[PDB]
Each structure stands twice: as C-alpha cells, then as structure tokens.
Design a protein around this ligand. Structure first.
Ligand SMILES: [Ca+2]
Lengths: 60, 60
C-alpha cells in the first residue's frame, strides 16, 4: 500500500548575532601647553562596553 | 549576511599651543652723565612672565 521512508520528522531552531562584541564611547580631554614646553596631563577615559557572553577581548 | 571589519571605533581629543613661552615687559630708565664723564647707574628692570608648564628658559 504505502511504504514510508521514515524521514519526515524535523525540529528547527534559530540563531543570530546582531551586535558587535564591544562598544566604545569617548570622553577624552585636551592638551594645552605653551609653545615648546614639557609636561604631562591626564586626557580622560574611554568606556568599553562588553556584550553578551563575551569574556576576553584582544584589541589594537 | 554582514561581515564587520571591526574598525569603526574611535576616540578623539584636542591639543593647542596658543601662547609663546615668555612675555617681556620693560621698565628701563636713562643714563644722564656729563660729556666725557665716568660713572655707573641702575637702569631699571624687565619683567619676564612664565607661561603654562614652563620650567626652564634659555634666552639670548
Ligand atoms: Ca615644563
């Protein structure tokens, strides 16, 4: 009568990667010496947000 | 779908040197001897303002 191939069974899921691993927002400052002067000053900072299940980051 | 180069992260600051290292203002006087005379006298002074993060100055 009917001979089934016994293959018509399926299960399906989805995957996505919609975000980059890091986000960088800058809060740097300024360097204001006189002409030819020597000095040092703190510039500011830069926030590096870490995204989903990211544990170690290697940057350049 | 989309292959990111992972380069579009930036942080920016500014620098400026808007002033010369020194300012010189003069308060000198006068030399008033007779014709052919020998003497000595104090002339005056000259103020040398020092600008931002300047520590050592070499002048001519
Ligand atoms: Ca200095």
């Amino acid at each position: 009568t009917t001979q089934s191939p016994l293959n018509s069974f399926y299960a399906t899921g989805t995957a996505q990667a919609v975000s980059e691993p890091i986000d960088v927002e800058s809060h740097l400052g300024s360097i204001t010496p006189a002409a030819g002067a020597q000095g040092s000053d703190d510039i500011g900072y830069a926030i590096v947000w870490i995204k989903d299940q990211v544990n170690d980051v290697k940057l350049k």
